[model samples]
Target: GNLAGIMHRPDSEMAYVVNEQTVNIRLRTAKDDIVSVELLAGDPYSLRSLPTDEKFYQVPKQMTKIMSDGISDFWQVTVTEPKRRLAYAFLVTDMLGIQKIYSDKGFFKVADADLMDMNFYFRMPFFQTIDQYNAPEWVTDTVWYQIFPERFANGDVSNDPVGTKPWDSTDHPGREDFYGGDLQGILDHLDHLQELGISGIYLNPIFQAPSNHKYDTQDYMTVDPHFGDAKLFKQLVQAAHERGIRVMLDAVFNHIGDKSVQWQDVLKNEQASPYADWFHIHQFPATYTPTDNFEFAADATYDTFDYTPHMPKLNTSNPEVVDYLLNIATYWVKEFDIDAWRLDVANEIDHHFWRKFHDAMMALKPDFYILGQIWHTSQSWLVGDEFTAVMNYSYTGAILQYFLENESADALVQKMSHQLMLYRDATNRMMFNTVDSHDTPRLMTLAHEDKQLAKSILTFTFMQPGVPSIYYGTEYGMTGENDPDDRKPMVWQPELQDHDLYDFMQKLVQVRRQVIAKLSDDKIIFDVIGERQIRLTREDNQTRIVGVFNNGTTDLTVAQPTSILLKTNQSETQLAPNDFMIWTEPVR
Candidate 1:
């Protein structure tokens, strides 16, 4: 009798074994006899895996030549059933004993399963450095300032009385209420922002959105008359550029206002409307009439009707709509030579539409960058594919909520590191990292109006991997809770100044610009000094910058090493509570 290998189910009904080179067998009846012996597992194997067995089962006798190299030989198995119906397992043996290598049910099937034995990784084709992955050409060393147009400054008194509705002038001041901050207002502040090392201004949507917070775009092409006409926008861009600051327009493409011209046309003309393709009409049935406004109807596509009736979701999939948006994007870059755009709710728009829009915008100016309004780790969208960068609200929100409101350093660290490693493209492009924006509660307010926490967070933001964006009034310690509140007036008077904070921000921004090459190339090495103490080492080819942060309630006396000490207060290196220190040294 010839020796035959043992075959059994993987786990009762399932069959699987690790495929290996050798098989052990006992003849029992023909130990020395020269009868023609057949290997039970295989006589010949093809590229196809047995459907019943789930892999390379029928290995030929000629294919079973064993080599000195451990586990280098293929397994040979023979089966009569159709490849799909048979169960299979690999037989392995050495001087010790026989061991099963592989067995399975469906998982090992070549078409449906991945190569379990293979380790695969991807290298980005477009990026030269880790920071280059999702990064656009314009944002590499740029510093952005987010301006809530309604509150920045009123440059034109002529537009002040042009408010269509009564303003919400509560809790601040009478004149300060609707100070008529227009495009000219932003233009006037160009010199001021440039002094603070700002490279660009990301003004919230200045299109003819009815609300002060212009997320609800009333008109895509028309400038809000109150914010000054298109001419003032061009002037703002020109002044900003002259002062070495680029202007990034905020675009609200996700939804449009019900009172918008297109929507109004859609309401009056219905199917015959020329701009009917500009909305998500197919998703909404005519039976489901809009009760309040012409936003998304009740029977709209995809659940969660949070996109209310007033803010109708646009049909970005249409080519005409695509061309219209692309033209809008191109107009700014070409007409005003604007540096970039801060895309509102970018993730909600169609992916193909964005790709087309991005390509069209880039065709006009390749260096024009677009940052998406994403509040999470959106590495997939940022990979030189759809967006150059995202709002990085994930890190900003977590850090602020943890440190300022919750007082949890551990949570902050965990959230921070999670964001840092969440995607392969973390360091690439500008993060557009901010503590506050037009939509969320201001960080200064979250800190209980504590200027220190604001400074600490901003300090970390500036020193981190991406470009740091400062909310317009943040430099003067603006305080507000949520959207309309967060969008406060810019303090121009030095007397109302948080000069220390302003000066500090200016220094950090200057350092970032001056040392962009160093900052971008170096990996941040962090030290967990204590639950409350965090130290980071930033290095380049020439120098290493070290930052020590103490989040504790009391001062910390840390031993100064000869290598790390830049200077110490008195004879001791003490990190004050809620304070941080930064210094640079030669990278020996």
Candidate 2:
């Protein structure tokens, strides 16, 4: 047996239940090292014994291949039964004529022990249907539009903070500058979003803060004065809901601006202040000098979000802090009726706090969505309790590489499939897939302004297996470097916008809702025609939605489909460089 090649965990991603009656159990082995795998499983009392033989046995169920990511080959089996109690183990066989029983307590050669022992098997004594990963079902049918409050639009100039700049200024925005954007501006543009076929709007931090982006919150209970009051936001939600769009607000609970009352108290009173314990303070005097690059000089005596002294991280473990933050969280859902939340610096916060938060929110609204901003694979948060999904930066990072680094289509498929193997179907369905945001450069800029290349990658994004999101201004072919530059104001002038790209994006959202969303199963086949041409297929029974792309220098042609949903740079059936076509057809 290839001991080093085998891997499995009892109650982890390797083995998890999807629903009460259905469970997916998986095993990983070195790439192509295993000949085959079988699931020898049943309830503890369901094993059978032969009259002549002393050994007991359970009927072996064959496992199917899910994916192989160069490093490992994943095999999975779906077990369904009316009775939820179950015990399971893997019967693994190597390329050679060697076999072993792999279970909760390591492995045993089948020759020495051919017994079905419940003790050695991985056990799920009872499956609480409630424990299954449950995200809002509607999320699968939705595509999100991300809005930055300061840069989205500027409708009410009177509410803009002092020293606001012209909305259409050509100069790059300064770190502390503002452009008079407000919630009323968003209310005025609902028609734009509706026309674009957007079903959800994810707004960045709009809570009261000193900074333009508002991540360092000064007050959790109040909306930014420059943006609007609670009345305006409530109206925004009511208006959005009328258009069948769910609105999600940003929650910056990890830290608050140093200018906040609690931080001000700590600054003036030090350990004497009642709110001193609200933050992690290292020394009596919580003070640090400034660096030229928007950071503090490391002499700070407190824990901050990164080294920025302005944003002090909260003590989430403290019960008072917990109660205070939860009250703030429930206020928006209860008062404003916002449909979802995007948690900032979510991975840095404690799990206990989120569990309590989830319980609190679910009690108020059952279908409310919670999306965490975790750039990596966060399996723990997506276990049907804390978060519905996280910002899928890891999934989109591969697509970015394919366009930017000139990575082959094979390399792209490898990473994409590996990410799929890391989570349950429920989590994948709710993943907030994004290519660009306030923190990253525009996708157009990332693709080096190659309209065809950008168009192809963006098209690929819409067809992928997650909830897709478009950063504001990206639909108009906006370009920026990063951060401050990426947060440029929305271009209202038709001459400054790329109508061609806008139509492409509009069509992507339309097809996404009509034809693409119906293809619910996330499992996909990326068939490579030669070197740079790859075709993707996702099918439900006979209905197949396909995507074909030519990522090489030369043009390529493939068989046409039942009907063309959308195509770019393709003449007849041939695709030019960095071009693609999406279509729906019956399974051939």
Candidate 3:
């Protein structure tokens, strides 16, 4: 009778293969509506019989009330069958003690006629290990450093674009300005990354593009001239690898720069162009005003990225376009040996293209990483077929709401619980977590220029389940508004940089790679105290880490920490406003 309250699905995040022999299944039921849950699972071909009449599994496996986000209770169970094939359904019992089988056909009492029919059961034709969801084992343990290549350094000036300014030109950089940051510059500064304890580096859009940010890509085959040649890039990757650092390159396949040959051909030949079907143009000429905020105005003819006419959205479904993009992607990995592909505007590209994209990359190197840029919920792509993980923007934004936006701890936990329910444990561990980036304001700016406040958020990022990333200059005290201001040139002068902030981050990174990475994601717990403060505890057989965050006006006393890993404006047992501390101890 409670259709909306009790739920189950087949072949989705709700029901998926956790491993070769295990299938993870989950169900959603209204809060407290069901008292018990069980899963009826077995191989489709091997059926046990009721000799008097027909057949059914009869013995259903128990499902626990694993977790809840206030509105719904999630019951979960793991099915480990040897045959590799499964047919299943839930045995849901309501609060009134009345029980029924929730099958693909419909809900029915255990003695119902349809119980004998195999067609009524939800089916998993087979568990294919090749399609099982798995992120590289190295990803979760890594602490990523996001580098805006054009601003990180400038060692080579011979290839600089004309009118290039000095490295420290100004505090505020315009949208299209460049400071001659090349691959050699980053190569020269490899020592700095090592000293900072960076294990992985994610370079924002390094491909040839006219814009300083490189999101509007023109050529995927060539690195930007100012950023050095393919040879120099290979040298950079090798040098970083030698120092135990991995390299991830950005790929902006959702759209192409107006300067690309594909778009130019369409402009010159119009409808008759052989590559005419490559982009989504409304009509011939694909006209737009340059001054109209990047290609979009009321009079524009084609669809550009965010109304910018210069960046045309690609028709990913077109066969030629798919092949072309795949080859370029495979070329980078095959030739340069890059570790990962960070897809820009990945949510805009079709699922079909990304599915093939995953196969191509995985075929070349089985453990290769594929990260996507999606600013919201992405359950559809996190399955075994597409992306390994997406930038956890929607999830991280909740943590920020508590620290920077004055939100309550319960509301924050509610949001956190909702997101954690959407994906599996593997996806959460490899998630790309960050508070600052090229798209958003610096973490320092978001913290209102308070150094301790900025460190508080940085500490929070490191303590979360996913891998953490530090935007360039964030660890060295950077502050700016969103977009161009946030993308300012790198400050290399030792006299001007903030060593105090950098020192604090170094401590956090050490704890992340050594302690947090070793803990199991499933063993973590979050609790709210009187709606004023929040506490998170993660433990393993050998160690336990506890953190308390005060989100209220008054101070509160928590247990004295055994060994404090990080503390911001906090006493031994008391926490002040905007204050937090993380501690670890041997789990006797």
Candidate 4:
């Protein structure tokens, strides 16, 4: 046995409370190194009464191998104690039948004499319900559709911004251009979204702002006039709820546009302005040059978002700033009954502020979803007290590299396994998983305009353990480069749309809803089967599904009678290059 390869963390994902009475413990060891593993667990005080000769009483159950990568195998067991306190360790048996004890301190003698000392065991202080990670229940079953409001659709030309460009007139758009997509447009297309099988919608920043993206907030209290009035937003939310679709609105609370009332007041009154403390203005007589050529580092007097002087970062630590932002969060959910919030630049904000934000919103709606826009790993914010989930750009990067760049399946599996292990199971399930968004190149474009390949990757995304989110127009096979180009206007013309890709996406949504949505976090498993093939299996008490993908140029085969759930091509045993197949039966 490889003693050094054995690993367990006492109070992390390795060992965490599933509930007040149950604790889930995980252990990892070198692949194929161990023959059997037993879990020694019981209430810490109860174990003291057990006779020293009877070690099996302490070892109540055996752990089963739940998952494995090529290099390591993960074992897990759920132990229940009414007292909510546990002292545990593992008894490992090697392939040669050599037995040993592994504990919080280190390896111990397998003999009953050494096990007498409770200090050698791992201790869980106490299980508190408050410490359990409790994300919104509805998020696990949701499939989200992300809409960049400026380009999704133009339902009301009357509300179009001044100098707004014609919808679908250009594939590439300038930064300042707006194609007049509004809340009414999204409302008008509810049938399309419902037909597409989307249960949730995530809209980009819609608060009052001059820019089409709306990241630069002019007012946090009102909806952008270009998008629609507050009445229209209320109606949109109600209509979506009537169709069983949840609505998530964006909140850009990190910064404010230079033209915002508070920021403008600070600029005009300098130190005398009551709102001066809201922002990080370095000088008393606050000044700024609005020219595009102004160098931020040298010309700007205070902190801003990405060195843009026009959008100054707020001082969230200030009580007044905290109260103001909290009110904005409260008003939206209270007034419109919105289901969730997609927080922008959330990582940049202080953790203290997010805790307050979480408490305030969750107070209003206990199951309210608060998703942060964090592109990287977000373990700190996902402790259940702060964010329910984050925009899973980490998953996007791995998926894009695997499908588009033809990266090795082994590398993808290794990266994904590590990523999945970083969060508790609940947080993993609620993640806002997306391939492309308003910030990245469209997935179709990244796939080099290969519609079939894009469909395969999209299908793989839907099968993952998270809330799958599709950027608007992806279902229609719209393609563009980054930023403004990625924000191109919606393609509504039936003749212009890629019906094949659209149909593929619709089918994927159906499969996700019918088959994959029922699986819980622990039931879904992902692994690398071969150099070019990856396998995903979701199994429960009644049903099981296996998805196989050929992420290479050559064909691949799985010798099993498969009831095909979704397929890119017709092949009973052989999966075509860049194709995938999902089946109900197991593959040998």
- The model with the greatest lDDT is 2
Instruction: List model 3 lDDT by residue over 1-588, tens digit each.
Output: 366877776788778888888988889988788899888888776664423442337787999886777788888888998988888888888878888888888788888836556677998879987777987988877999999988888888898988787777246888778788878889999998888899999999888889788887888999988788898999999999999999999999989998998889998999888878898878887787557354356656877778777788899999999999999999999998999999999999999999999999999988888899999899989987899999999878887777888777778877877787788767888789999799888888888888867877787768787888989888788878988899888778778789998888888899888888877643667788755588887888778888877767888788887688888764888888768888988877
- Against the true structure, candidate 4 reaches a TM-score of 0.93
Model 3, runs deviating above 4 Å: 1-3, 48-60, 94-99, 110-116, 289-295, 520-522, 586-588
10 residues in a row with least lDDT, candidate 1: 118-127
Global local distance difference test of model 4: 0.84
Per-candidate TM-score against the hidden true structure: 0.72, 0.96, 0.93, 0.93
Scanning candidate 4 in windows of ten residues, the lowest lDDT window is: 290-299
Q: How many residue pairs clash in each candidate at the backbone level?
A: 31, 0, 5, 0
For residues 187-235, write the lDDT of model 1, one tens digit per residue: 7777788788888788788888776666777777778888888787887
For residue 414, give model 4's deviation from the true position in Å. Answer: 1.2
Best by TM-score: 2
lDDT per residue as tens, model 2, 1-588: 558878887677777777778888889988888889998777665554334443224468999878887788889888875667778778888889688888878888876654556677788777776777777878988999999989888989889898999887245887888898889999999999999999999999898988788888889899988899988889999999999999999999998899999999999998999888999998988889787877566777889999899888899999999999999999999998988989999999999999999999999999989999998889999888899889999989998888778777778888987998888766777888889999989888888888888888888887788899999988999888888888888988998999999998998888889887876464677776767778887778768888888888898877766588889854658888888888887766
At residue 353, give the lDDT of candidate 3.
98
Q: How accurate is candidate 1 locally (lDDT)?
A: 0.61
Model 1: number of backbone collisions: 31
| lDDT on C-alpha atoms for all candidate structures | 0.61, 0.85, 0.84, 0.84
Which candidate order results from sorting by TM-score in descending order?
A: 2, 3, 4, 1
Error of 1 at 497 (Å): 2.4
For candidate 3, the lDDT comes to 0.84
